[PDB]
Design a protein around this ligand. Structure first.
Ligand SMILES: CC(=O)N[C@@H]1[C@@H](O[C@@H]2O[C@H](CO)[C@H](O)[C@H](O)[C@H]2O)[C@H](O)[C@@H](CO)O[C@H]1O
Ligand SMILES: CC(=O)N[C@@H]1[C@@H](O[C@@H]2O[C@H](CO)[C@H](O)[C@H](O)[C@H]2O)[C@H](O)[C@@H](CO)O[C@H]1O
Lengths: 133, 133
């Protein structure tokens, strides 16, 4: 696995910023946010070439070990072999993810945790920088 | 406890940059670095006024759960209610903690691990930014 951080205590409205290097031959990377590995309010999974998907952002929740209903975006502002920054915040209704080119999407908040306490990165994304606001 | 990060994979010569908020009423804060919570190549513990120490940095190791022998500095460049930045690196001989204004603290490398994989903050220190170089 990649970087795992806990005790984040990220409250509604606070910004979590992650900057990393996307591998030149990247097939996929993951940012998981929530309470723990079984309880994710956001599974954020850009798929360059994985699970039969191409240049597709896949998002989901995981609640008590169970994947929720998957959602995808049409836009894919990531390139292999470049640096990517992602900024995440949430309120009780939605997570809001802002992407490098100013792209911003919302994913329903299905878990309604009081805070994001857990983040894990995986796959072809080398984290260089994590910041809190 | 404060932020805990694992799978850091920080190798010799690589630089861990941490910026945090020292609480206004700070009595003590901690940065722990090593393999896991029981194997610390550096316990970095500025004590403003705790355990009978005043404005003293206490450093130690922990090896398979057992604390080593404490090393202490006279020089104390931390202030309560402020922002502190440190840059940490290690080699075969020492861990080095550097502050921007040029303070440099060295602690013997007692564990000789291949990497720092674990970092944890505790006490009156709120981490706001972590970077890898
Ligand atoms: C179990 C399985 O393979 N599920 C398939 C999906 O792949 C998983 O998607 C989740 C997020 O929803 C995680 O990314 C997990 O790592 C993936 O294996 C796949 O996206 C969909 C659509 O093809 O099919 C599921 O069955
Ligand atoms: C159990 C205990 O209090 N040990 C004393 C030391 O305090 C601990 O020191 C370690 C680092 O070596 C950690 O900072 C831990 O949090 C502290 O409780 C204390 O520094 C010395 C002398 O002042 O005595 C030890 O027995």
């Amino acid at each position: 696995c990649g970087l795992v951080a806990s005790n984040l205590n990220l409250k509604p409205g606070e910004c979590l910023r992650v900057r990393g290097e996307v591998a030149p031959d990247a097939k996929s990377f993951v940012l998981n946010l929530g309470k723990d590995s079984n309880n994710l309010c956001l599974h954020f999974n850009p798929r360059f070439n994985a699970h039969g998907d191409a240049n597709t952002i896949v998002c989901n929740s995981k609640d008590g070990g169970a994947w929720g209903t998957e959602q995808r975006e049409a836009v894919f502002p990531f390139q292999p072999g470049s640096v990517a920054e992602v900024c995440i915040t949430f309120d009780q209704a939605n997570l809001t993810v802002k992407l490098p080119d100013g792209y911003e999407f919302k994913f329903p908040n299905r878990l309604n945790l009081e805070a994001i306490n857990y983040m894990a990165a995986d796959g072809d994304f080398k984290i260089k920088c994590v910041a809190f606001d």
